Design a protein around this ligand. Structure first.
Ligand code: CL
Ligand code: CL
Ligand code: CL
Length: 229
């Protein structure tokens, strides 16, 4: 049968993203709009910095900017925590440690507001170097593919993950961003606690040639894979 959560994602769903950020005291806000199509694990979003110039590189915000849109293969459906929490939603919390630099702490509430899937985020960054790779804008405007290992977090009735993102720098090295993540349901209703599995991500960053505001266009695909060999 199709679950309550699953039924909400059978077609194309509008997405709204709102982020309020503060990195080393530099305040900024971002709004995003687009659509998700979970049947294909597909996200298409455009983000605009509504406060002027973004004080950090756009790529550093990609992981922060709706895992309920992942494609879970039929045989994997029992491991989809994210849709199972809907429509009431879930909270995603992360700490993102940029190696040899500062860290972000994020809290996101992901839930439906009517027919729109909303990702409401607060981000605080501390201990950044004003001339490091982040505040110095030394990251390439691109993005690598990554696999994320999802684990149940029984004590929190949710899931957790840790994974390392590699942001390419033009000197050929990378800026590592070490992510630690915990997700908790917003409702007190039932959720699916998964066995360990992977989410595979591909992300493409682009610009709208007609857009004068500081912005990012993101195309992202997310697909689950299991551990039955
Ligand atoms: Cl950028
Ligand atoms: Cl998530
Ligand atoms: Cl390196």
């Amino acid at each position: 049968m199709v679950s309550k959560g699953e039924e909400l994602f059978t077609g194309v769903v509008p997405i709204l993203v709102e982020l309020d950020g503060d990195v080393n005291g530099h305040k900024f806000s971002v709004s995003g709009e687009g659509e998700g199509d979970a049947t294909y694990g597909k996200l298409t979003l455009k983000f605009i910095c509504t406060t002027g110039k973004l004080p950090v590189p756009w790529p550093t915000l990609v992981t922060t900017f709706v895992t309920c849109f992942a494609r879970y293969p039929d045989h994997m459906r029992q491991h989809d925590f994210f849709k199972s929490a809907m429509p009431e939603g879930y909270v995603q919390e992360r700490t993102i440690f940029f190696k040899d630099d500062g860290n972000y702490k994020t809290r996101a509430e992901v839930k439906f507001e009517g027919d729109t899937l909303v990702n409401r985020i607060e981000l605080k960054g501390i201990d950044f170097k004003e001339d490091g790779n982040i505040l110095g804008h030394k990251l390439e405007y691109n993005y690598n593919s990554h696999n994320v290992y999802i684990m149940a977090d029984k004590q929190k009735n949710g899931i957790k993950a840790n994974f390392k993102i590699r942001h390419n720098i033009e000197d050929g090295s990378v800026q590592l961003a070490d992510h630690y993540q915990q997700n908790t349901p917003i409702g007190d209703g039932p959720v699916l606690l998964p066995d360990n599995h992977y989410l595979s991500y591909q992300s493409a960053l682009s610009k709208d040639p007609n857009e004068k505001r500081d912005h990012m266009v993101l195309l992202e695909f997310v697909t689950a894979a299991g551990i039955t060999l």
